[PDB]
Structure formats: structure tokens, C-alpha cells
Write a structure and sequence with these properties.
This is part of a larger assembly, with chains A, B, C, D, E and F.
Chain B: E1 72-76, E2 92-96, H1 104-115
Chain E: H1 4-11, E1 20-21, E2 24-25, E3 50-55, E4 59-64, E5 78-82, H2 88-98, H3 103-129
Antiparallel strand pairs in E: 1-2, 3-4, 4-5
Chain F: H1 8-15, H2 19-25, E1 27-29, H3 32-38, E2 42-44, E3 50-53, E4 62-63, E5 67-69, E6 74-83, E7 89-94, E8 99-103, H4 108-117
Antiparallel strand pairs in F: 1-2, 3-4, 3-8, 5-6, 6-7
Classes of the chains: A mainly alpha, B little secondary structure, C alpha+beta, D mainly alpha, E alpha+beta, F alpha+beta.
Chain B binds 4 RNA strands through strand 1 and helix 1.
Domain Ribosomal eL28/Mak16 (chain E): 6-114
Organism (chain E): Leishmania donovani
GO cellular component, one term (chain E): ribosome
Chain lengths: 160, 129, 154, 54, 146, 120
RNA sequence: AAGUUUGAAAAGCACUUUGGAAAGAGAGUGAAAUAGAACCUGAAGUCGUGACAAAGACAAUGGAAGUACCUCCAUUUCAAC
RNA sequence: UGAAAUGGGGUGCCCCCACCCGUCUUGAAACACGGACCAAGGAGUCAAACAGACGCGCAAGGGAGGAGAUAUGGUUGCCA
RNA sequence: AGAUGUGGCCUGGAGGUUAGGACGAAGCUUAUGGCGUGAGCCUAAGAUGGACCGGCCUCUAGUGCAGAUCUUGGUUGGCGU
RNA sequence: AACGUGUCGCGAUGGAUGACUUGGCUUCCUAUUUCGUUGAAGAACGCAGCAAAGUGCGAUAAGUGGUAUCAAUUGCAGAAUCAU
């Protein structure tokens, strides 16, 4: 809240043959008499300083949240949408692909791979895997280095 | 692949629109901006001031967006994008993107010359055999 | 970098330059540019005569207010001037480009001067004290100088 | 004030915004869930120490 | 049951297959015949569709959807190769059995693939004919594997 | 100097890492013939180790590692060299992760490490 | 006020030569030295230099419409065409 | 197969047309005020109460808030 | 003056999707042309550069400059006065 | 003719843009977390083979002691010589 502010700056006024903005008070430094307290001044405030009390989080009707997930599943059962939504889905045996309950029994990861290759899902997880790049953007420097495409989520009833 | 011919290609106005009094100032860009000046001569249409853009300058909508070769220009980043315009190649032509490569640019020149789709910035020596 | 231009047949040529030479730009602009076509030996003659105030360095630009002179008639201008400080510098630079050409196996008596060029250089500042407690820049203005030579023969 | 709109009673006159000048009585709940996970973690730990007392 | 009418309002303005570039809307769908973005030409979307798609030399495949195995994908797209010298009205009349909407395009596309293959034959012959004269200082071969 | 998520704390804790951390951080892999014997994936480089460069422009050179310069994040080998302008040779430094440990010096606390690493 | 960010590595230009020196001309290192110390990229503005276009005083620019000379940017054509 | 040709571009010229921008103003080319050049900065935002349009859910019912409960009593994290 | 519309142009980022890049990314420069009434886009060349990045749907905002005796840095005619 | 103007090719002056980031801001959590007459916070001088600032340290002064670690530190010189 104090950024671009701490200064003794006042305005010289009219009659000094200079703009009327406030100016830093003192002497012997490079910034003596420079402008202060304004968004235009080099280093002044930002225009309307951002706050923490912005409205960050929106409510949603409890119902519409339910409607929306329900409505989002009916799109998971259509192979045409899924085609254009981007997943390969070429060799997938059937739209609500369904698998056994023993899938929870795997322990080594090498076996869960040949599973995905058996129901054909290894073609999509090679769309995610071959799409990993370093971002174009400033996001690299924020803690996000890599972009990946979104993959074939798998739904297991228990946490286990 | 001789293009689809249209009617006459006449443009209404070739000369560009440049903003008022940009030559005087080196920072002013030649791009247009509408003068809002109250006593500004250009806004008032003084005959010998520069002309403004209108709805009236349209390109005839028949020959609109057609390059001088007769091909509406469709951009292409990779050899797979040639297949879309294989069928309409009489109409559209491809434009290799800037960043596409000396190596990929080798491929698209081949797989265009085979399909007879036309590339603008594609090498023209295969055409002038 | 530098050397804005390139000699034709650089196998016969002598480059030379000085950079950030402390001397006035606007005076060295004038005393260098007089040479630009002159063979070496006659470009040095020109300078030893200027120091003797027989001939003069014509100022074609940077004339703003100057004394008229009768020695500027040979060059077509009325205005001229005799800048020893900047002549003595160009004396040593031409004497360098003669030492380059002589180590290249050339006879300097046939060397003709081509492409003399003078540019502004980073100028260094000093202050000045004025009425009513003011201070105003006293800055000076050094120059960059570069030239090359080439032979000439029948 | 202009138009048929309702007569605004918003009470904001007192200094609340923490303007570069002042501090200002603003309470923000951005820590709500982190204190939701904390009150639970501390009901469990006490349940783990109180054992087997209800 | 998610009619084509309803699915075309969903995928119209966003898609993997949309590919609108420089103001033009083409379609990168493999099942488009000519490549415009419209219902009659969306192969992935429609409940019955067909394509004229090439194969070796001049053979012309045709891939064909149908109502019934509509889900279950390796089973929903069925390709059948016509012989090399096939007439174009032959291929179109195949597509017109499934989807008579496409009877014109499949013809124009059948004649098109036939033009491409005999175009590749002239080119690839003339490139290698004058490729002999060039002495290459490198070439690469992927070694056969067992 | 552990990898974090934040990359600002990671690079910071990496380049402000003190000496001993810089000993671990710069560690070469050791040749298969020394992986067979000690059953260890890689070790931090010591002074006298004899070592082969796999990484670059010196690729295939073999030398004794004069000294480990931990401030420059670099190892100095024998027979990895360059001549200055004036004709003397100066040891060209190479980063350890680019290099391979063929023969490593042994001392009693360096052995207590190889016993302590054993995967078996 | 001020990134001291050269480069992968100082390999930070040995040496010859003109100079009182600063430096210049060579050479050498390096993929780049137009990366040579402020050293990555190196913009605008202003200035120099070769070439060239011309140009009377109507302050200059500006509109529209031609022509003169360039441009070699684009598209098109080249023979039962 | 080097050229020809049409278009675009550049520089000069001719006949003609043409007051200096932004602004306050009944009125600005004004002997009205701001104005040497450039680069980078530079001005309707955030929050709350009320209303009316328009999008959505539900409907004589609608909707929470705070908290609790577990998948999560887990996970560096993705999970605030 | 003012009101609104645009499948309307641009900018930093987040959710998606599709691509590019040491055979040369962003940036930069150009009598480089092409497209759009226009904001602008796109290709060509760099004897520029040295590692990132484009399109499209949606979200998002510290999002578009010529003017304030605007701020800061630089430069400049006056003036070799 | 000269000055001056204009276009291009290169060159200087100038330090923008992008790419780069151990900095900033803000939000959150953990805890046998709160200084001082047993001389604190702040102040001054000093200390290194070479030492201006800065960091560390106090006449035991760029550090002593103890444990853990396991061959450096490093611009230069110097230095027991590998089982601690």
C-alpha cells in the first residue's frame, strides 16, 4: 500500500516555470526535484493500486454445479465430440470404454502400461507424452515450466 | 494449376490511408487514426485534405481477398496441412509460415509439387522447370 | 568495426584511424575533409602551410559566425580559419597511415588519399558557474577520425 | 442524485481502505480453508491423545 | 440420443478439426471430402458418412460409416479398396449408396485422386531421372529388423 | 540445493550451496566396470581420480584430474589443456556430469561411502 | 543512480610494426572479435561518409492526376501459345 | 527462357487543388492558450448497497453464510 | 457532444487445442511486396540476431498515446556563437 | 558554382526492445518461537601473509573449542601429508 509513495514530495506550484505535479524535496541527489505521487511519474504509484480484497472466488448455485457435471458426462459417451475435443480414440473398443475391476490390482507400473496398450489408450497417452514443450510466455519464470496436453482420465471407485 | 478466374480485378483505391500530418513528426506511424479534432480540417472534408475511410471503399466482394495470382492465400505450417486444399487447389494456395524451416520447407516443396497445390513462397523453380 | 567504406584493391592501401581524439569535432571536420582527394605528399604540404598561416583550412560547414579571409579564395569559400590544434593531430595520423603503407611494401609518394571521415564521439562533461547560482553544461566534443589511402599509377 | 434510483445508505465514511496514508479495519477471509484444515487436524490430534475417551 | 443436429451446434465454433486460418475456414478432418467446414462435410460428426481416400498406385479406397456400429470405433469406420482403373462414377455410386448427399463430391474427388497418383508418377520419375547425375556425399538407410 | 517446485528457491539454494553440498552436486558417473564391482551409480569426484571425458570437444580424452575447483563448478584434468597466447598451457576446466570415472582413488572415509551406497 | 549479462571455456589478443604515450596497421584465440572489457541483442532521434536524385526565389510538408527516370518487389506470359 | 508485360514501390517535374495542430469558444489560420526531437512510462480502476436490461439454474418456493463431515486420518506438490 | 453494434484489430498472462524452432525463436532493420474501407495481418530479405514460440475457442487484466508549463533518460538547432 | 535539401549503402552518437532472473509483493502453514544490570538495541574503533568497502569476528579478532562431513581453500603466496 505504501509503494510509490514514501517521499516528502510537495508541489512547487505556479511561478516556478515547471509542471504543477508534486516534487521530491531535498538536494544533492539525482532525484531531487523529480516528480512523485503520481502514476505518470517514474516510480510513482500504479494508477489504482491492486488490493487483496478483490473478489477472487465466485459462488455457484449448488444445482448448476451438479447440472454441469452431469451434462459434462453425457458428452463423454459420444465418440464424435471426443474425436474433436482432441483425443485419438481410434482403436478404442467402445465409447464408455469400460474395463475390469482387477485394474486396481496392479503394483509394478510396467504392467499398467501394457494394459493401456491393450484397450488402445496408449495412443492418446502418446499424444500427451509427445506434446511436452517449454512454454512460450513469462509463465516459464513463474513456477510453470512445461505444457502438456490433457490425457485419458481413469476413474477408479475406491481411493485404493 | 491455373487459377479460377474471376471478373475484372479493379481496386477502388490503391493508395493507402495515412493519418493526418504524420510526415511532420518522426514518431507518428503511417497507420490510420480518425482525427477527433474539433477544428481539424480533415474531419470537415476540406477538398485537398486527406480522405477518410468509409463503408464505400469495399473490394467488390467477388474479387475480394484474391492475390494478384488469382489465389486466396491459406497458410501452411507442415506437410499435413497441404491435404486440406488438395481438392480446392484451383481456389486456394498455400503460404509457408515464416518460422517453418529449411528442413520442413524442403518437405512441403516436394509434397506440394506432387499434389499440384500451389505455394506462393514455395520454391518456384519446380514450376518454371 | 568502424571503417564505413571499403578500399578497392585493399592489397594496395593503408588504413588508419584514431578514435575519441580530444580536439574539436567541428574543427577537425573541416581540416580533415579538405584532404579527401589529395595525394599524400600534397596533403601534408597543405598542413605545414596552414600552420605557417599561408594557406588556410576552408570551413564549408560550421561557419556560423567566422572571420572572412583572403586565403579561402583558393577553395571557393570566403570563410576560412587556421586550427593548429586539429592540424597537428591530422599531421600525426597521416604520418601513421604512411607508416602502415610503408610496411605493406608501398611507396608513400604515390599514395592518394580516399575516404576521410570524421564523426562525433562520446563527449565528456564539465560544469560552468553562472549568475544567480545556476550551473550549466560546459561539455567538450572529441571526434573519431578514419581514413585510408590507395596507390595511383599510369 | 440523478434518476429514480434508491437512496444509497452505504456506510463507508470512516477510514477503512488502507490508503497509503492509513491502516483501516479490513478483515479478509482468504485463510478460511487453511484454518478449516487446521481445526480438523487439531480435532484429530486431540482425539489421538484423548484416546480412548470420547 | 445426441442427434447430429445437436452436436453440430456444439463443435461448430471450437474443434480439433476446425483449423480456421487467416479468415478462411477449412477443416483438417480426415473424413472431409473437399475440406469445407459444414455439416454435410463433417465426417466424424455425422451418423452416416463416406470418404474417397487414396491407396497404392491409383487405387481408390472408400471409408464408410453407418448407423449401427456407431460407437465402438475400430468397428465404425470400414474401408474398401476399388481396383486401380476404377471409373469415377463407380466410386461416387458407392458413396451414394450410403450418403446420397455426397454423390457429386465423391465423384469429383474420385477423379481427383486419380489425377494425383498419375501426377506423382510423372514427377517422381522426373526427379530421379535427373537425380542420377548428382553425386551425393551421404545417404541414409534404416536397417531391416527381425 | 534440493529441487523444489519454485525454481527461485531451487536456483538460489543451488548457486548459494556451500562447499560440501557442491561436492555432492558435482559428481561424475563411474564406468560400468566400477559399477559392477562397487554396485554404485555415481560418486562425487575426488582430487586424484583418473577420469574420462564423454561430453565434449574433449570427448575421449583421458586424465588424472589435477584438482576439483568447486567455486567454478568445474574439474581440472590432466591432458585436458590449452595454450595461451604466449605459449604456456592452461588447464581447461570441465564439468563433472560430463565426465566418467574410470579409476577412483580410495581412502578410508571414501570407502565408508561405497559401503554406505550399496544397492544390494 | 547503477543487471559487473564477454564467452561453452579467459582461450582476456603472444609476437612484428609506426607512435613519447594513447593508440593505429598486421597477426593470433574463438563457431561469432560487427562477442575485445561499459564487452548479448544494439531500436528511435541526431550526425558523419561514398554514391545518386534533382532543385530559382512561391517556407516546407499535404491532395488528386499524369509523365520522366529508376526499382528488380510481385504476379503473368513465351508459339496448333 | 533471357527478355516482354501488367500491378505495387521510390525520386523529381508539370497543370490544378490546399491556412496550423490539440483546445475553451456564438465564433480559431488567428496578433487566444499547450507545442524543439525521440525512446520508455502515462489517466473511468477495485469494493460494497440498489435498480433495469440480457445469459443460466430452480420455481410457491429459491439460496446460502459460517461450520462440520470424509475420499483427504493422504499428497513436496497438482488440492486454497 | 452523446448512445450502441461488430464472427473487430492489437497487448501481458491462465484454462484448452494445433503447430513451429540451431536447416535459426522472440527482438530488430528494410524503394519486401500481398491482403483488408480500417484498426491491422501476412510473405519476402537482413552480408540481423542467438533460444525460444505462432494459430484457434474460452477466461483474465496494471491491455492500445502525440499534446497535461505531463515524468524519467537521451539527443538537438541556437553555435565553434 | 558553394551552402542547403532528398533517397539509398555503410558507419558513429545513444541505450530502447526482447530473451535472461539467487529480487520484490502478497497469501498460507509449522513451533519445548520473544531481548536487557549475568551490561541489551544502537553507536565507535579494530582484526586477514597480502584487505579500501562489504561480510565475519573481538587483543584467542576473516576466528578457538565439540560433533557431523570426508579432501580442499583458490586472485596470489603459504601449509601436517591421508587415516581423521
Amino acid at each position: 500500500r505504501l509503494s510509490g509513495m514514501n517521499h516528502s514530495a510537495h508541489s512547487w506550484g505556479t511561478g516556478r516555470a515547471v509542471a504543477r505535479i508534486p516534487r521530491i524535496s531535498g538536494g544533492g541527489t539525482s532525484t531531487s526535484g523529480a516528480g512523485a505521487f503520481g502514476n505518470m511519474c517514474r516510480g510513482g504509484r500504479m494508477f489504482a493500486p491492486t488490493k487483496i480484497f478483490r473478489r477472487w472466488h465466485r459462488k455457484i448455485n449448488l444445482h448448476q454445479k451438479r447440472f454441469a457435471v452431469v451434462s459434462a458426462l453425457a458428452a463423454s459417451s459420444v465418440p464424435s465430440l471426443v474425436m474433436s475435443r482432441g483425443h485419438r480414440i481410434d482403436n478404442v473398443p467402445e465409447v464408455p470404454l469400460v474395463v475390469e475391476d482387477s485394474i486396481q490390482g496392479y503394483e509394478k507400473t510396467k504392467e499398467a502400461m501394457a494394459f493401456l496398450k491393450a484397450i488402445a489408450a496408449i495412443d492418446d497417452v502418446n499424444r500427451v507424452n509427445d506434446s511436452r514443450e517449454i512454454r512460450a510466455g513469462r509463465g516459464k519464470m513463474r513456477n510453470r515450466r512445461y505444457v502438456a496436453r490433457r490425457g485419458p482420465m481413469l476413474v477408479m471407485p475406491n481411493n485404493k | 494449376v491455373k487459377p479460377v478466374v474471376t471478373k475484372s480485378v479493379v481496386k477502388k483505391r490503391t493508395k493507402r490511408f495515412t493519418r493526418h500530418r504524420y510526415e511532420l513528426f518522426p514518431q507518428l506511424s503511417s497507420s490510420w487514426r480518425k482525427p477527433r479534432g474539433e477544428d481539424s480540417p480533415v474531419r470537415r472534408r476540406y477538398k485537398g485534405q486527406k480522405a477518410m475511410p468509409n463503408k464505400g471503399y469495399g473490394s467488390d466482394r467477388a474479387t475480394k481477398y484474391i492475390t494478384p495470382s488469382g489465389f486466396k492465400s491459406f497458410p501452411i505450417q507442415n506437410v499435413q496441412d497441404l491435404y486440406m486444399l488438395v481438392m480446392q487447389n484451383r481456389k486456394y494456395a498455400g503460404v509457408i509460415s515464416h518460422t517453418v524451416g529449411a528442413r520442413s520447407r524442403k518437405a512441403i516443396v516436394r509434397k506440394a509439387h506432387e499434389l499440384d497445390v500451389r505455394l506462393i513462397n514455395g520454391g518456384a523453380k519446380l514450376r518454371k522447370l | 568495426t568502424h571503417y564505413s567504406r571499403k578500399p578497392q584493391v585493399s592489397s594496395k592501401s593503408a588504413k588508419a584511424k584514431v578514435s575519441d581524439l580530444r580536439c574539436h569535432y567541428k574543427n577537425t571536420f573541416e581540416t580533415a575533409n579538405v584532404i579527401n582527394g589529395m595525394p599524400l605528399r600534397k596533403a601534408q604540404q597543405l598542413y605545414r602551410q596552414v600552420l605557417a598561416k599561408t594557406r588556410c583550412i576552408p570551413f564549408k560547414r560550421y561557419n556560423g559566425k567566422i572571420g572572412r579571409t583572403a586565403q579561402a579564395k583558393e577553395w571557393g569559400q570566403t570563410k576560412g580559419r587556421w586550427p593548429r590544434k586539429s592540424v597537428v593531430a591530422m599531421m600525426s595520423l597521416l604520418k601513421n597511415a604512411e607508416a602502415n603503407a610503408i610496411e605493406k611494401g608501398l611507396d608513400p609518394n604515390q599514395m592518394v588519399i580516399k575516404h576521410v571521415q570524421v564523426d562525433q564521439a562520446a563527449r565528456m562533461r564539465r560544469r560552468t558557474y553562472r549568475a544567480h547560482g545556476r550551473i550549466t553544461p560546459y561539455m567538450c566534443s572529441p571526434c573519431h577520425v578514419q581514413l585510408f589511402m590507395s596507390e595511383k599509377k599510369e | 442524485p440523478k434518476g429514480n434510483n434508491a437512496i444509497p445508505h452505504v456506510h463507508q465514511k470512516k477510514h477503512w481502505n488502507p490508503c497509503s496514508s492509513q491502516k483501516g479495519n479490513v478483515k479478509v477471509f482468504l485463510n478460511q480453508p487453511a484454518q478449516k484444515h487446521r481445526r480438523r487436524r487439531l480435532r484429530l490430534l486431540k482425539a489421538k491423545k484423548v484416546f480412548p475417551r470420547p | 440420443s445426441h442427434s447430429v443436429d445437436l452436436q453440430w451446434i456444439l463443435v461448430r465454433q471450437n474443434s480439433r478439426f476446425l483449423q480456421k486460418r487467416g479468415g478462411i475456414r477449412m477443416s483438417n478432418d480426415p473424413f472431409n471430402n473437399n475440406g469445407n467446414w459444414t455439416k454435410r462435410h463433417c465426417g466424424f460428426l455425422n451418423e452416416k458418412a463416406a470418404v474417397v481416400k487414396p491407396a497404392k498406385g491409383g487405387a481408390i479406397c472408400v471409408t464408410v460409416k453407418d448407423g449401427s456400429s456407431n460407437n465402438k470405433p475400430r468397428q465404425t469406420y470400414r474401408k474398401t479398396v476399388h481396383a486401380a482403373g476404377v471409373r469415377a462414377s463407380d466410386v461416387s455410386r458407392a458413396v451414394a449408396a450410403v450418403r446420397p448427399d455426397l454423390a457429386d463430391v465423391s465423384f469429383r474427388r474420385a477423379r481427383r485422386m486419380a489425377c494425383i497418383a498419375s501426377r506423382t508418377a510423372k514427377v517422381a520419375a522426373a526427379r530421379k531421372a535427373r537425380s542420377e547425375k548428382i553425386k551425393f556425399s551421404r545417404k541414409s538407410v534404416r536397417a531391416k529388423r527381425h | 540445493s534440493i529441487k523444489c517446485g519454485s525454481r527461485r528457491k531451487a536456483r538460489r539454494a543451488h548457486f548459494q550451496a556451500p562447499s560440501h553440498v557442491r561436492r555432492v552436486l558435482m559428481s561424475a558417473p563411474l564406468s560400468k566396470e566400477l559399477r559392477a564391482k562397487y554396485n554404485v551409480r555415481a560418486m562425487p569426484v575426488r582430487k586424484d581420480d583418473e577420469v574420462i571425458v564423454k561430453r565434449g570437444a574433449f570427448k575421449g580424452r583421458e586424465g588424472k584430474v589435477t584438482a576439483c575447483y568447486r567455486l567454478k563448478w568445474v574439474i581440472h584434468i590432466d591432458k585436458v589443456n590449452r595454450e595461451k597466447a604466449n605459449g604456456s598451457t592452461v588447464a581447461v576446466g570441465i564439468h563433472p556430469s560430463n565426465v566418467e570415472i574410470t579409476k577412483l582413488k580410495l581412502t578410508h572415509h571414501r570407502k565408508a561411502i561405497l559401503e554406505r551406497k550399496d544397492r544390494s
